[PDB]
Symmetry: C3
């Protein structure tokens, strides 16, 4: 049915609901076998990963590095200051050299087009470790965390309040494929990419889900089962701090926000979190799934790597989505 | 009897003589099995370590990284420039995320209070990789090196000449627990922390050992079995170079220093060494145990990790202390 | 016959034709067993490597790191910004500490004399990862790539056009030992080291091969089976960009260069490549072996490490040289 071996993972728009559910099934299987049963599964023995990071990272870095190694493989952390990329060398040449020396690449970049060049020029899987446009592997952790909390995903309403950034784009490329509704509030002038919105409208129509884009936080939060935010100033945007602090006033998630949400509301944030987007009462609430979510970055990137590099079949019963 | 699994190791003041002897016993066992018998002991297979370094390191870095990996685990080297800590993220949040992704953390920091926050907020063992206040794992290497040289430790006199810094504080938190005497000379105004001195007086009283603090190098060296020094300008103190070079004149360890020491005198230095604290004749003397000492940083951090993360029992006969 | 265990590899002038052929035989054996047969060969299990890099690297870094780990060992990446070297610590002391903590060192340096100090002061193998004077492990990859292309090496003419740098010096220390001829063109004032040239004349005489040094690109290319170039501005020489761009005009390798070469001509470049030394038509030609060559950096550094640290014997039939 689902065949993911050898594929790239640059964005969730290139994946069906069934393929993304397969990745969450494998995540749950690997988490059960290793975290709960204590098995050692050397599924990536004799394999290596090239990790290119052009931006800082705590969770993507740790989850990917300890995750690849936990399956018996060798992760190699490469930064801008150590390798030749950009300066003495082109991306086409870097891509061909990585192909012959590693079995896959995870790259945290600025330009999504750099991930496209890497996928075209390399003959090994390229995984997006976050770009300015999309962050697909974050949403894998998010939807596994919500399936574990609610015991299913179909019919949940996701309520985004914040910037029209990479995280919202990845939710837009995937929520309807799971039968989930999306209500998203951004400041005026900080909307999601018109092309992404257009494709999210199509997915909503195909799956019979709702998509609401607004500038009002309480309209996005109304009836939502999950409240979701992120920093107002993403990496590479620090020059705009002053303008963004002014434009985003009134967009902090608080218990006033939650009062309008469904009674079973929970909260997500990809982290790192700052005091601006959400207050401490919601961030550290018993309803906040932020640290479960962060943990699931590890079991989901392990599943991505196993599905793109092996023919391993999940032993676990498929979770209810 | 001794149970160390799950504990943090932030300072040796939180450890009894019997617990620290257990760590040196395990070090000796692991050194004998792997270095001498050539066994491969995958005791930390399926485990990972988060290594946070806010300061430079050659020995703590190499001993910890090659040591964790030699036992089958995966070490992950994280610096200030790569992870979000300090800048985009709090230590509480970093601590909770590390907990769900690694099995332990070793952190070389400035503030000991940062290690306290990490231990309180993480549910996994936190090991001090050096702070401004204490460096417990250095003293583990030091006392293993002296037990190997002398075939026991009880009744030795340690003679510190130098700054009232982290290394002297760690010796003060541990020497009396082994029945060792301490005679320490620092410049006036560069004494050890009054709280540490107070607690070292109490340990000396409980164990019936002597504690002498002086400003005279030859008084500290008199009758000492081990001469010990370190840099006059510790990491983070480079602004004070001029004032310290002036204040520490006359505190260089030389053969004049050694003439006053016991006939079986040896020499220790945690490294890196500069020409100021000790001359070449003592540093490279046959009595200098500096490079044995540096090697034992590896077998002792391996023992720390095995004792805090497993239920492994030493097969070796307990060494005489 | 050949015994390489415990030796350093600082330059190919310290190696006979038979010893270098042994290293290419082991490379071919390891490539066949692991890449083609898919075997997992944990030959360096329980071993570690200290990797000191004072300059940037993509290929030496990846090939060495994934290569050491593919054989079951642990590679440790150490940079100038993380370890004490240069600043708080001497190379003699760093060398002795590395000896007791790792099983070998690979170091990419500026001064070849730093590699000499490391080899004298350490009791473990020191491998040159590139210095200003020599880059021996590059030529191992190059000659394996040419043996795979041509099915033998004896009698080939290597045609260097470019700077009288580390790569040309390493070709000069080795081509005649394989019965290969060398014709090399550099700009006036940018010749190879007079001592290296002198020793290359002696090797040419002992092996009955030709050695031609010229300032004319087409004289170096005439009748050559392999065209070889590299950057005009090596790492550490960026201050000389203006003077070198002017002095090296007319030294770009093009199809005009190739028109003069033997009919079976191929092309090599150690990478990273810039547009100055060679054009796109030659670089991306079907005759360009640049990306095969880059891959073989991995199988040859694996063979170096296995031959200096173990008693493993190649199972493969010896390749024809
Ligand atoms: N919009 C934010 C998203 C950060 C995602 N965070 C993570 O993936 C967690 P990490 O940075 O610790 O790996 C930005 O682009 O800056
Ligand atoms: N008082 C000194 C102690 C240095 C300890 N050295 C070590 O642990 C050896 P390393 O720095 O190579 O890891 C200071 O605080 O600067
Ligand atoms: N003459 C050049 C040689 C570069 C060698 N390149 C390599 O070894 C490939 P890498 O730098 O990606 O490891 C110089 O000294 O700059």
């Amino acid at each position: 049915k689902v065949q993911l071996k050898g594929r790239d993972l640059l964005t969730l728009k290139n994946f069906t609901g069934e393929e993304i559910k397969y990745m969450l099934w494998l995540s749950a299987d690997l988490k059960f076998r290793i975290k709960q049963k204590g098995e050692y599964l050397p599924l990536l023995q004799g394999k290596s990963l090239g990790m290119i990071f052009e931006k800082r990272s705590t969770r993507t870095r740790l989850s990917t590095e300890t995750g690849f190694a936990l399956l018996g493989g060798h992760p190699c952390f490469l930064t801008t200051q150590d390798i030749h990329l950009g300066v003495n060398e082109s991306l086409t040449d870097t891509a061909r050299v990585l192909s012959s020396m590693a079995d896959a690449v995870l790259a945290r970049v600025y330009k999504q087009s750099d991930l496209d060049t890497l996928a075209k020029e390399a003959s090994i899987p390229i995984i997006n470790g976050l770009s300015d446009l999309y962050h697909p592997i974050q949403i894998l952790a998010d939807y596994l965390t919500l399936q574990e909390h609610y015991s299913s995903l179909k019919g949940l309403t996701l309520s985004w309040i914040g910037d029209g950034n990479n995280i919202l784009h990845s939710i837009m490329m995937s929520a309807a494929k799971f039968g989930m509704h999306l209500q998203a509030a951004t400041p005026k002038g900080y909307e999601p990419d018109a092309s992404v919105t257009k494709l999210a409208e199509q997915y909503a129509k195909e799956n019979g889900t709702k998509l609401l884009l607004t500038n009002d936080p309480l309209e996005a939060a109304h009836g939502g089962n999950v409240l979701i935010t992120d920093t107002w100033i993403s990496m590479g945007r620090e020059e705009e701090k002053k303008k963004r602090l002014q434009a985003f006033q009134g967009y902090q998630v608080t218990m006033k926000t939650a009062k309008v949400a469904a009674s079973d509301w929970t909260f997500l944030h990809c982290l790192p979190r700052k005091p601006e987007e959400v207050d401490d009462e919601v961030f550290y609430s018993p309803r906040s799934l932020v640290f479960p979510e962060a943990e699931n970055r590890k079991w989901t990137i392990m599943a991505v790597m196993v599905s793109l590099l092996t023919d391993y079949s999940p032993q676990l019963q498929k979770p209810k989505f």
